[PDB]
Amino acid sequence: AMNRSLLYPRATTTRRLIGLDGMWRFSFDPESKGVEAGWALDLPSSLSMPVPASFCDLFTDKASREYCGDFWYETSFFVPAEWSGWDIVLRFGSVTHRARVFVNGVEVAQHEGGFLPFDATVTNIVRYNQFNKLSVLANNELSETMLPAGTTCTLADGRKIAAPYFDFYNYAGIHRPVWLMALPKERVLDYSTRYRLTETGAEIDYTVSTNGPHPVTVELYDGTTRVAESSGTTGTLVVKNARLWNVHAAYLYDLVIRIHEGSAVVDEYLDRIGIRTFEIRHGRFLLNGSPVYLRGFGRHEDADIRGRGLDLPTVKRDFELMKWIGANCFRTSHYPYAEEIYQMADEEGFLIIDEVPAVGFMQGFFEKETTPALLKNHKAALTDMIDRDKNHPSVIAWSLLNEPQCTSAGTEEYFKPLFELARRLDPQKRPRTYTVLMTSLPDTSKGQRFADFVSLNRYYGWYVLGGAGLADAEAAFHHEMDGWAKVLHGRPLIFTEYGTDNLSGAHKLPSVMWSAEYQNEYLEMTHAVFDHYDFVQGELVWNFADFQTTEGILRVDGNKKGIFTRQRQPKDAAYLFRKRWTTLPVDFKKR
Amino acid sequence: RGFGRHEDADIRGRGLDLPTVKRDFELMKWIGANCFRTSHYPYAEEIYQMADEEGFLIIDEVPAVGFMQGFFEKETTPALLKNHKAALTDMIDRDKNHPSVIAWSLLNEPQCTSAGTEEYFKPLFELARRLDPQKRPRTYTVLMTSLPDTSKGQRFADFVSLNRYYGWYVLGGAGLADAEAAFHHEMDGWAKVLHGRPLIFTEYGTDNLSGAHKLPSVMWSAEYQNEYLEMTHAVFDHYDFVQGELVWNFADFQTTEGILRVDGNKKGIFTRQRQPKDAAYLFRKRWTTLPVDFKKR
Amino acid sequence: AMNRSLLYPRATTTRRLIGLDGMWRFSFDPESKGVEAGWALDLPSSLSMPVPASFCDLFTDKASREYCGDFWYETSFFVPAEWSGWDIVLRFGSVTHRARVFVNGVEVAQHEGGFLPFDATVTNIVRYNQFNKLSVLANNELSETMLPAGTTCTLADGRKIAAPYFDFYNYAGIHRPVWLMALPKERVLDYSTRYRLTETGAEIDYTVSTNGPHPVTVELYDGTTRVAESSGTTGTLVVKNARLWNVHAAYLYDLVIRIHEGSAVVDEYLDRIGIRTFEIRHGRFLLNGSPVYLRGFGRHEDADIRGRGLDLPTVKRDFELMKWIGANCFRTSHYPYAEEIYQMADEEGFLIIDEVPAVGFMQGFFEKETTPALLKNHKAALTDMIDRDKNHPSVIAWSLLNEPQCTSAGTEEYFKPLFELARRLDPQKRPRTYTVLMTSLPDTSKGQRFADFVSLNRYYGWYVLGGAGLADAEAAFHHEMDGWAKVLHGRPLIFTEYGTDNLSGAHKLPSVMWSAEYQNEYLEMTHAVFDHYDFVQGELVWNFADFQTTEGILRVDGNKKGIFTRQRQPKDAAYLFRKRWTTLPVDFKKR
Ligand SMILES: [Mg+2]
Ligand SMILES: [Mg+2]
Ligand SMILES: [Mg+2]
Ligand SMILES: [Mg+2]
């Protein structure tokens, strides 16, 4: 509340850190009776459930996989006697979609939104040198006032079912690491950085926010050598001969933030930062003053068995694959990802477009009576995403919506405060975008004028004019691009989705839609369109890997537009992209 | 019990291939089928000759498919009817002496709610009666949008043939029990309009790829297909007037390109290379267990 | 050393516990220069590596996947000031295959064997309220004196390659959770339990081993109710109306072991135990005095991406699948598994045959000059496995070797002390077995007479007499079984391997080897043989899931005898087993 902080939890001189991941207890609550019946004190019946994971794909029955409603997680944690006098705080990386947290039966936090972190202060609720009960009442129902948007339906037997307005499966559960922290009562809550390159090195302007009056120092280490230091909650770190963070050539420095009372250290926060500038100038993405042509993926937090659960082996493999294929960029479609993925991007020198879960916004959608409530949740998600992610060198842009009905009346009243908030929140003033639906054209989109660069999701040759008529698709595509050329007025345009479903091993000569041949033919046509226009400055293909969707006749066990399989092996299209992306120079498409 | 078929195989399109024909009959004997429909066109004579020798029942179908203002109000309808009459005449003249041929299907999924349906159907069903010395029963297959109370064509049929996809095209997915209740709802309507006539199913099924397994099921998996078939057959088995099940389709076959078609149609009980999918074992156990005179009336 | 303890690490009244899993640093050391060059103080170059995982399948290049030799893991851990006076101990669930551990550059532990835990005491090496460097020098080379056995070879360019004598891939790395512990200097090191059923309940005879003189109490809780208590390092817990642990009907009690100095608690250990008896009598496996026909799997610690890394979501899914299919039993082929898998078996009521990595033992193998060294490592592994696992209610038997060349001269001299050790180590005197190679026949096996029950790995109809001649395989199989009937003398026999490689979706009518049809035909024939003989008391099929092997023309991307795919979905054979295993009564095969 007053001590809100989205800093990644750290063990430091002054902070203790204990992970609570593991096997928890779990119970569905179909009659929504748990609070009144006393389930926060003990679950009457339960089953074992690993945390972090989505719960859905662990079961063998469909009613549990598709369960929609209230469900409970429960575990126990020990608070050492020697933590007395510290603040005792629980961190949830995320709980999907909303959560009420109880410790020893007393409610200590509430959170809305399934993809961003929140804390629960339990200093005066825990018993010291004893075990404590942690109960989480979570809910995964969908509505038109949340991110992501959808509805729920009732089946014949009375079970609730989720009905998303979005393509991906409604995975819920506790997807990210949970932490038990001991923190000084006076502590760092936040910090910000801005970067500037100079003739002899670089400068970092910083702020630090603490919840108290005691002085702050900030130091920057390159290994064991201190390269900069500064007193005060605001200041500048001067880094002579700064080693800059670059695409596929990351360099990170160690940041030490301390609060002092006299000669004692009252709090210490530790992080790693990269020295880099990023901005649009002259219709180009400039990284450290040099243009970068973006190439990479829309992704998902999705894998076999675990749903959206964080899995560091999968994360490592995914980066090894993105390095192998020559990607330099990905978008966090369609929700902020676990912090650990950005940390790895920070180390591997990957560029991230950070996206809030504003997907499914499709009378027009923005005329609904419920729009003010939706906007409130959208602003909160945006605020939390930018506060959590603003110091990652990898994060270079914000995507504020995915495929909204931006031809709807009321679009401008909705977009204007959102894009203003994104400008205000970001000390680095990184470019803002949103991805454009196929039904929003250059001349009808009410939202495109707000974007600092335009992001298109286009499927000319799949959803539109697919099949034997690939050349009709190409001409329709060129037709629309001529429109975008007229409305862009210098702005870069990138593609954030395109591709075709194709199964590993489906070969046909000549091609049919769903075959490897068709995908390769579609990609070659699509890239020829891209390459025709000087303003196209990035291609992010849909999707890095096959991922799970709701059931439907259009979805052959989920979405099959992966460049890799869900098991993280290449499909034939991975070799097309590898040759292209490693052949295109980093500054492809002079403007 | 049996199949809607196609004259379709790898490489040759609809070309006649006696080895494929022999294999297909060996498969239909193995699975316990006794019947198939020549969807959606008369087949090569050699297939009827083999049915004659293997003791299979054939519903013989003219290529009156794609008839979907209403379709039967078009100015071009008189010309269409002329070609339809000629095809019907030639089909019945060619096939009338096959012992295997026991029924005529005059249209596949026409828009039989269209105005002008009766003016179109009446002379066709009369011609089929006149042409056949054996006066074998006449049918046509009913589109999913033609309901017991709205179909203008069903009253002409000697037995009703339904193409139904409750749980695939309509109410598919986690909601399989909603599909079952909607299906029972429509069947209660058919019970009211049939007036003693047999009803058979001439299409039903789900696309599923060989080897796609998932627990619990998703549409396109072997599990889903088996779950859908068990639900569907429980509906069939509930009604004394359901006197036949011909599933779609004997084998995976080629369609035009589209996002809905994973290299053609994948509702085959066998692959296009003529090997069983998991559903072939469900049908084999069922069809060889049901007595020949199942469903006393 | 003197404080050796294989107890699972626990947070208690007196013990602190901090997990160290996460992203570590990692470096190959192909020239084996790291110790002399100072890598324990810092790795000169490194890459990020998730722990726990095998390292091999994260990379995109084969030289790294197949790397054989020395490799380094490195991380940092913080020791709080307020841990001063506690013992500071690192626990490694496992390091594969051997490890040298350094803290702040000083060597603090050495361990041989890749599948069992070890500790490193670092009390006097760490800096307090500071960060500390943890470096692990690991090695994955194979030899004929280790478990599992193999050799290494040198390729043309000089790279070492592993050449296993075993089928499974030589996954190495840090496969299991790593822990930082604060423990009282006087503490529980071990405890043992034996169970006895009475007319009014049950009795548990216990021992407790501490490294000091202060008194011990032991308590047993059912929820918040204490149901038994006892003073002394030996004693009996009397549990009136004991709720017994049963197959698919587990019941666990909470065990509290405390050391006291006066009225202060100096140490507390916490565990969960199940009250059950298990023994062979009258040629039957008796669980709580009732016979159980064993059905289930040989398994592997194997999954996509992570190699043998522990993954609790995969573990949960695997148990959900084993419950769905009707299994009641599995063998930990071919090495002890992560403790967490036994803990889940304890909760789901599954029976485990616990197996030491004595695989690849195939002049005869037991005439080699190196046999005394091999036996030494085998005894150590056996000792550690039984000490680690003896208190799991799920663990009901010990498998001492997998497919040794037990026709070799010297077999008896090797087997006799091993089976004697297994008897001595186990307070519960659970039955001992080993799995019999296909070339070891009833009349030629020198080892079978040592087994309390015989375990056969048989492939009649796959490796031997496969194809159109399935009926020749059946008669050869009956022929050998008539031999086993003559040598068993009342002992149960179980099958611990059988099956055929078959790809998901490979259908052929009529069957060919590798098709679903063939697998079903082979299983039906095989089970008809099983069902013919009253002494066959268990079937554990090979294998639960497709798993990775070394490359070869016989291995279509690993081993394809899985009843489930590697992604944990059923193949057609899963439905055959589900119908059979849920139809057979629990006490099938009266004797
Ligand atoms: Mg999506
Ligand atoms: Mg400082
Ligand atoms: Mg093996
Ligand atoms: Mg006690």
Residue numbers in the entry:
A (entry chain A), C (entry chain A): 3 to 364, 381 to 609
B (entry chain A): 297 to 364, 381 to 609
Sentences from the paper on this structure:
Three of the previously characterized L1 GUS enzymes, EcGUS, SaGUS, and CpGUS, were singletons that did not group with any other GUS enzyme, while EeGUS clustered with two other GUS enzymes from bacteria identified as Eubacterium sp. FpGUS clustered with the new L1 RgGUS and three other L1 GUS enzymes in a group we have termed as the “L1 Cluster”. FpGUS, LrGUS, and RgGUS share a similar core fold with EcGUS, with 1.7 Å root-mean-square deviation (rmsd), 1.7 Å rmsd, and 2.0 Å rmsd, respectively, over 576 Cα equivalent positions. The L1 GUS enzymes CpGUS and FpGUS demonstrated moderate pNPG processing rates, exhibiting kcat values of 57 s−1 and 58 s−1, respectively. However, FpGUS exhibited the second highest Km (2.2 mM) of all the GUS enzymes tested, resulting in a lower catalytic efficiency compared to that of EcGUS, EeGUS, SaGUS, and CpGUS. Sequence alignment revealed that FpGUS retains five of the six amino acids, termed the “NFXAA motif” where “X” is a hydrophobic residue, that make up the alpha helix conformation in the RgGUS loop, indicating that FpGUS may also be capable of forming this secondary structure motif even though this loop is disordered in the structure of this enzyme presented here. Of all the L1 GUS enzymes tested, UNC10201652 was least potent towards FpGUS, with a predicted IC50 value of >3 µM at pH 7.5. The alpha helix formed in the Loop 1 of RgGUS and predicted to form in the Loop 1 of FpGUS may block the active site of this enzyme for productive binding to this substrate.
